[PDB]
Structures are given as structure tokens and as C-alpha cells.
Scaffold this active site. Structure first.
Site, mmCIF file in Angstrom:
data_model
loop_
_atom_site.group_PDB
_atom_site.id
_atom_site.type_symbol
_atom_site.label_atom_id
_atom_site.label_comp_id
_atom_site.label_asym_id
_atom_site.label_seq_id
_atom_site.Cartn_x
_atom_site.Cartn_y
_atom_site.Cartn_z
ATOM 1 N N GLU A 123 0.967 -4.068 -5.684
ATOM 2 C CA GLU A 123 -0.068 -5.067 -5.423
ATOM 3 C C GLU A 123 -1.390 -4.644 -6.063
ATOM 4 O O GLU A 123 -1.777 -3.470 -5.993
ATOM 5 C CB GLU A 123 -0.254 -5.266 -3.908
ATOM 6 C CG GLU A 123 -1.412 -6.201 -3.525
ATOM 7 C CD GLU A 123 -1.431 -6.570 -2.037
ATOM 8 O OE1 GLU A 123 -2.425 -7.195 -1.587
ATOM 9 O OE2 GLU A 123 -0.460 -6.252 -1.315
ATOM 10 N N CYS A 181 0.826 -1.209 0.000
ATOM 11 C CA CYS A 181 0.000 0.000 0.000
ATOM 12 C C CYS A 181 0.867 1.269 0.000
ATOM 13 O O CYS A 181 1.955 1.282 0.577
ATOM 14 C CB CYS A 181 -0.943 0.005 1.204
ATOM 15 S SG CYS A 181 -2.335 1.150 1.057
ATOM 16 N N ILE A 182 0.381 2.329 -0.647
ATOM 17 C CA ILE A 182 1.103 3.603 -0.725
ATOM 18 C C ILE A 182 0.123 4.721 -0.368
ATOM 19 O O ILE A 182 -1.056 4.655 -0.735
ATOM 20 C CB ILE A 182 1.730 3.809 -2.132
ATOM 21 C CG1 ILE A 182 2.412 5.167 -2.249
ATOM 22 C CG2 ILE A 182 0.681 3.666 -3.236
ATOM 23 C CD1 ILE A 182 3.184 5.335 -3.564
HETATM 24 C C1 LIG Z 1 -2.250 7.692 -4.782
HETATM 25 C C2 LIG Z 1 -1.651 8.808 -3.925
HETATM 26 C C3 LIG Z 1 -0.539 8.230 -3.048
HETATM 27 C C4 LIG Z 1 -1.052 9.893 -4.818
HETATM 28 O O1 LIG Z 1 -0.277 10.781 -3.994
HETATM 29 P P1 LIG Z 1 -0.096 12.346 -4.314
HETATM 30 O O2 LIG Z 1 1.002 12.884 -3.425
HETATM 31 O O3 LIG Z 1 -1.408 13.084 -4.282
HETATM 32 O O4 LIG Z 1 0.438 12.247 -5.845
HETATM 33 P P2 LIG Z 1 1.153 13.415 -6.709
HETATM 34 O O5 LIG Z 1 1.016 14.726 -5.972
HETATM 35 O O6 LIG Z 1 2.501 12.881 -7.128
HETATM 36 O O7 LIG Z 1 0.232 13.516 -8.030
HETATM 37 C C5 LIG Z 1 -1.178 13.708 -7.865
HETATM 38 C C6 LIG Z 1 -1.728 14.829 -8.746
HETATM 39 O O8 LIG Z 1 -1.308 16.106 -8.245
HETATM 40 C C7 LIG Z 1 -0.636 16.835 -9.271
HETATM 41 N N1 LIG Z 1 0.452 17.676 -8.723
HETATM 42 C C8 LIG Z 1 1.633 17.265 -8.238
HETATM 43 N N2 LIG Z 1 2.344 18.347 -7.834
HETATM 44 C C9 LIG Z 1 1.579 19.431 -8.064
HETATM 45 C C10 LIG Z 1 1.762 20.886 -7.853
HETATM 46 N N3 LIG Z 1 2.906 21.359 -7.309
HETATM 47 N N4 LIG Z 1 0.761 21.716 -8.215
HETATM 48 C C11 LIG Z 1 -0.369 21.227 -8.755
HETATM 49 N N5 LIG Z 1 -0.563 19.911 -8.958
HETATM 50 C C12 LIG Z 1 0.393 19.006 -8.623
HETATM 51 C C13 LIG Z 1 -0.108 15.773 -10.222
HETATM 52 O O9 LIG Z 1 0.048 16.299 -11.541
HETATM 53 C C14 LIG Z 1 -1.229 14.766 -10.183
HETATM 54 O O10 LIG Z 1 -2.267 15.322 -10.978
HETATM 55 P P3 LIG Z 1 -3.096 14.500 -12.082
HETATM 56 O O11 LIG Z 1 -4.496 14.453 -11.493
HETATM 57 O O12 LIG Z 1 -2.945 15.344 -13.329
HETATM 58 O O13 LIG Z 1 -2.384 13.167 -12.165
HETATM 59 C C15 LIG Z 1 -2.756 9.462 -3.087
HETATM 60 O O14 LIG Z 1 -3.885 9.744 -3.928
HETATM 61 C C16 LIG Z 1 -3.254 8.621 -1.932
HETATM 62 O O15 LIG Z 1 -2.544 8.523 -0.829
HETATM 63 N N6 LIG Z 1 -4.443 8.014 -2.025
HETATM 64 C C17 LIG Z 1 -5.132 7.181 -1.028
HETATM 65 C C18 LIG Z 1 -4.285 5.928 -0.783
HETATM 66 C C19 LIG Z 1 -4.466 4.856 -1.850
HETATM 67 O O16 LIG Z 1 -5.516 4.768 -2.494
HETATM 68 N N7 LIG Z 1 -3.444 4.009 -2.044
HETATM 69 C C20 LIG Z 1 -3.409 2.885 -3.001
HETATM 70 C C21 LIG Z 1 -2.559 1.737 -2.429
HETATM 71 S S1 LIG Z 1 -3.378 0.664 -1.204
#
Ligand SMILES: CC(C)(COP(=O)(O)OP(=O)(O)OC[C@H]1O[C@@H](n2cnc3c(N)ncnc32)[C@H](O)[C@@H]1OP(=O)(O)O)[C@@H](O)C(=O)NCCC(=O)NCCS
EC number: 2.3.1.48
Length: 276
Positions: A179, A145-146
Site C-alpha cells: 500500500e 502495513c509492515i
Molecule cells: C521497514 C522495516 C520493517 C524494515 O525492517 P528491518 O527488520 O529493520 O529490515 P532488515 O533488517 O531486513 O533490513 C534493514 C537494514 O538492516 C541491514 N541488516 C540486515 N541484517 C543485518 C545484519 N545481520 N547485520 C547488519 N545489518 C543488517 C540491512 O542490510 C538493511 O540495511 P540498509 O540500510 O543497507 O538497507 C522497519 O524499518 C520498520 O518496522 N519500520 C517502521 C514501520 C514502517 O514504517 N512500516 C511501513 C508500512 S506502514
């Protein structure tokens, strides 16, 4: 007299008051109040501000409880054996479940390694996210998970977490993939990462690259490479095998990517040997 029996509708973590997406089995009493405090270092939960404050004053380390296996000017990564930090890791899993439709039993943390990322500034370390990983995965999954904490989402941290997970695989001399099944948010983040990775290789390494070469450089599986190449329309046959190739579309995407000036993981700063 009305006796209120409330659900957990908000957690208070440092200055943040965060609303959960899903239920998490915190072993707490249901009361007329709908919040708990989560300490941003220990991850311990408290029904009352006063109890939280009492424990906050205790002398504790101000970063996750593990070995610091990566440190650059922007982030640190700490590697934690769930078996060696049961309480802290259980607390991390309870917090994570608030933002997941499902998660394996939070209490049983022994089978996992946890890789926790902090941002460092003038105030010290701040936990922003983590990925877990099975010590032994039958399917060779390189992430279980992440999670990026909600108060820090969409800032680029999730991509750093993914990038780091593949640097472990590379050091391990193995391919890997997250996963399955993966949440929609989790999968869209991976597709963006896989896409940016192939685009960057085509511009910075070689204009034409074989599947073996990509896999060796990235630890991405054949399946994930092919799915990404087909989406980008860059799959071809050249010199007797399948390759991905550079075109104007890819160059444009690369330039837009670089324009964003985003941080990346430096593989040279990963100081780590696989168990062996
Ligand atoms: C999946 C997850 C880890 C992504 O993490 P995150 O830190 O939000 O990811 P990022 O910031 O790298 O990218 C997410 C979005 O933000 C955008 N972004 C990143 N930096 C940015 C900035 N400085 N300004 C504006 N947007 C930005 C990215 O472009 C991406 O946009 P998209 O919708 O065009 O793809 C997060 O959604 C999460 O924790 N979800 C719940 C847990 C989960 O479902 N886990 C699955 C495994 S069990």
C-alpha cells in the site's frame, strides 16, 4: 505542589525498554509516570509493574493467536483474522502506531488479516514483526502495513516479512505491491528486496528473463519490476520484448549478497490455500 502530566516516553516489553517514535492513542490515564508495560505475548498494556506481573502469571499460550501456516528451523508465521482476535489485534495496532507517522484507526481490525512472524529458540517463540493485509483491496495491495519491532530491527527480519508476503501472492496467482504511500524506511526496504530478487533470478535461473517471466516467478508488478530494472541498468530489448539481463555488476552484487549468509523463506513450507 507540582502535578506532572507525562507523555508515554518508554514502553517496557520483556527485558527491553523502548522509546516510541510517535504518539499512539493508548486509552490510558496520563500520570506523573512516563512508562507502560507491554506483555510480550498478549500485547496487553499496564500502568503498573505489579498489575503486569499479576496477569503474567495467568496460564496463556506463548505465541500469537492464529494458525501456524509456515514453520522452519528459524521462524514461524501465524495467520490471524482480525475479526476473530479483536483484542489482541487492536493491541498490536497500538504498539505498531508508536513507530508510524500515521495508521488507520487502531480499533477497527475486522477488515484485516495479520501475518505475525516469531523467532524460535531454546526459550520458545518471540514475536519479532508482522504485516497486515486487507481481506479485500481495491488496489490489490499485498501488504497494508509492515513492522519489525524496534528491538529486532536491522537483523534481516523485515526482508523475511516481505518475502513471505509475496509467497502468499504467488500461491494466490496474483501480482501485488505494498500500500502507498510508503514510509521512507518501508520503501527503501522494498527497493532492496526487489533488487536482491532480480539479481538472484539472473544468476540462479536464466541470464535473460522477460517481464512476464519475472512477474510469474515473483508476483512483483510490472511497475515495480521496471523501476528496479532501470535503477540497476539491466533493462533491454531482446527477441521482440523487454527483458532484464545479467552482467558483471550483477554477478558481483550476487556474490556479495550470498557472502552475507542470510536466511530466506522456503516456499515449500508454506502450507496454505487462499480463501476461494
Ligand atoms: C521497514 C522495516 C520493517 C524494515 O525492517 P528491518 O527488520 O529493520 O529490515 P532488515 O533488517 O531486513 O533490513 C534493514 C537494514 O538492516 C541491514 N541488516 C540486515 N541484517 C543485518 C545484519 N545481520 N547485520 C547488519 N545489518 C543488517 C540491512 O542490510 C538493511 O540495511 P540498509 O540500510 O543497507 O538497507 C522497519 O524499518 C520498520 O518496522 N519500520 C517502521 C514501520 C514502517 O514504517 N512500516 C511501513 C508500512 S506502514
Amino acid at each position: 505542589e507540582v502535578a506532572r502530566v507525562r507523555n508515554l516516553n518508554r514502553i517496557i516489553m520483556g527485558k527491553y525498554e523502548i522509546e516510541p517514535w510517535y504518539f499512539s492513542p493508548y486509552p490510558i490515564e496520563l500520570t506523573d509516570e512516563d512508562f507502560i508495560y507491554i506483555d510480550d505475548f498478549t500485547l496487553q498494556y499496564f500502568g503498573s509493574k505489579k498489575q503486569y506481573e499479576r496477569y503474567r502469571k495467568k496460564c496463556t499460550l506463548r505465541h500469537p493467536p492464529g494458525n501456524e501456516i509456515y514453520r522452519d528451523d528459524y521462524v514461524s508465521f501465524f495467520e490471524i483474522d482480525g475479526r476473530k482476535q479483536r483484542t489482541w489485534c487492536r493491541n498490536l495496532c497500538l504498539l505498531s502506531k508508536l513507530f508510524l507517522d500515521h495508521k488507520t484507526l487502531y480499533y477497527d481490525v475486522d477488515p484485516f488479516l495479520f501475518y505475525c512472524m516469531t523467532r524460535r529458540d531454546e526459550l520458545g517463540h518471540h514475536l519479532v514483526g508482522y504485516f497486515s493485509k486487507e481481506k479485500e483491496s481495491a488496489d490489490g495491495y499485498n501488504v497494508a502495513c509492515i513492522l519489525t519491532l524496534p528491538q529486532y530491527q536491522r537483523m534481516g527480519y523485515g526482508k523475511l516479512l516481505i518475502e513471505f508476503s509475496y509467497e502468499l501472492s504467488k500461491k494466490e496467482n496474483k501480482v501485488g505491491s505494498p500500500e502507498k504511500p510508503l514510509s521512507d524506511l518501508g520503501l527503501l526496504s522494498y527497493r532492496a528486496y526487489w533488487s536482491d530478487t532480480l539479481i538472484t533470478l539472473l544468476v540462479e535461473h536464466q541470464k535473460e528473463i522477460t517481464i512476464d517471466e519475472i512477474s510469474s516467478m515473483t508476483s512483483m508488478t510490472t511497475t515495480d519490476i521496471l523501476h528496479t530494472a532501470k535503477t540497476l541498468n539491466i533493462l533491454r530489448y531482446y527477441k521482440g520484448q523487454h527483458i532484464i539481463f545479467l552482467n558483471e555488476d550483477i554477478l558481483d552484487r550476487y556474490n556479495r549478497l550470498k557472502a552475507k549468509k542470510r536466511r530466506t523463506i522456503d516456499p515449500n513450507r508454506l502450507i496454505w490455500k487462499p480463501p476461494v
